[PDB]
């Protein structure tokens, strides 16, 4: 796989050099944030079931047809899949968030996904929509926890967003 640290290494390797002092200071700082980083992840995982449940409800209220005969979320079998999918994407996103790198998400999850969806006749648009719906709910938790020391998580929040968005984009 890859993650923030490993990445920087790899770059350095091809130059053939020891790590730049500048570059260390990226990682040094990254460390400092860890604690924040972690809690973020924890928040997602903790609320997982809900995040999904929620997003779904809203997805189906919007695009009624998906659940109607002839739509893509009908019948049960399909419905199930659609739920499962959302979850998966989420799972990955989380992973990334911890790693501090998109890769894992892109490689295992997003790669080829669009085409699959196309071949099946799944409407890519709707999938993307769902991803966002999820995003917002998720951030909701990340950003409003209880019993955590109060401070600024923005930096992490935005990175979270980006991950969701890469997802949305590549699916769409």
């Amino acid at each position: 796989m890859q993650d923030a640290f490993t990445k920087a290494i790899v770059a350095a390797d091809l130059r053939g050099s020891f790590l730049s002092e500048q570059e260390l200071n990226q990682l040094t700082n990254l460390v400092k944030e860890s604690n924040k980083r972690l809690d973020a992840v924890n928040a997602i995982t903790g609320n997982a079931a809900e995040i999904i449940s929620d997003a779904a409800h809203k997805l189906f209220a919007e695009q009624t047809d998906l659940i109607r005969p002839g739509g893509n979320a009908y019948p049960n079998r399909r419905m199930a899949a659609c739920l499962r999918d959302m979850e998966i994407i989420l799972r990955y996103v989380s992973y990334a968030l911890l790693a501090g790198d998109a890769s894992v998400l892109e490689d295992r999850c997003l790669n080829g996904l669009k085409e699959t969806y196309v071949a099946l006749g799944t409407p890519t648009r709707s999938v993307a929509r769902a991803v966002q719906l999820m995003k917002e709910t998720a951030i909701g938790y990340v950003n409003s926890p209880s019993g955590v020391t109060r401070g600024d998580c923005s930096a992490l929040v935005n990175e979270a967003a980006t991950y969701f968005d890469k997802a949305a984009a590549s699916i769409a």
Binding site: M1, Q2, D3, F5, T6, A8, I9, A12, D13, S17, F18, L19, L24, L27, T28, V31, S34, N35, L38, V41, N42, T45, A48, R91, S94, Y95, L98, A99, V104, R108
Partner: protein, 162 residues
């Protein structure tokens, strides 16, 4: 590449489950340690050169005959290579400290070590000395946990080489 963080993800991924508390605990460990790790790397990076010189040198003292004509240690090209190589080992070690895992070492140095060495008739022994001599020097510039970390990785290679 094997680091703490990558592994837990991997394991989580295989089972098909979210990262739960179990894994995070582990990750936390990696991060706490890093501060020491990072320090060690800064120390090696700075003294690199000097360590290298000292090592290369040592090897020759240990195995005089190498410097004789018709041998491997003989003629500058070879000496240059010898230097280069050790630099590498060092380089990677630093990497691994920072990455917080053996990963970097494994993939660059270790995997396929044997066969390379066999086909070019590099005697593991040599490298080893280099390392040992290094370890000894490092055992001055560093102290406490920073030191401990440095060792671990240095050794890991000794073991892989032998």
């Amino acid at each position: 590449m094997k680091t703490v963080i990558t592994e837990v993800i991997a394991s989580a991924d295989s089972q098909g489950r979210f990262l739960n508390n179990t894994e995070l605990q582990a990750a936390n460990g990696r991060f706490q340690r890093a501060t020491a790790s990072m320090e060690a790397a800064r120390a090696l990076t700075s003294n690199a050169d000097s360590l290298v010189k000292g090592a290369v040198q040592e090897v020759y003292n240990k195995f005089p005959y190498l410097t004789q004509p018709g041998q491997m240690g003989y003629g500058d090209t070879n000496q240059a290579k010898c230097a280069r190589d050790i630099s590498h080992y060092l380089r990677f070690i630093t990497y691994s400290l920072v990455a917080g895992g053996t990963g970097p070492l494994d993939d660059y140095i270790v995997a396929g070590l044997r066969e390379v060495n066999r086909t070019f008739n590099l005697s593991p022994s040599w490298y080893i000395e280099a390392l040992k001599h290094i370890k000894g020097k490092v055992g001055s510039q560093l102290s406490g946990q920073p030191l401990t970390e440095a060792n671990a990785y240095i050794d890991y290679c000794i073991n892989a080489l032998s």
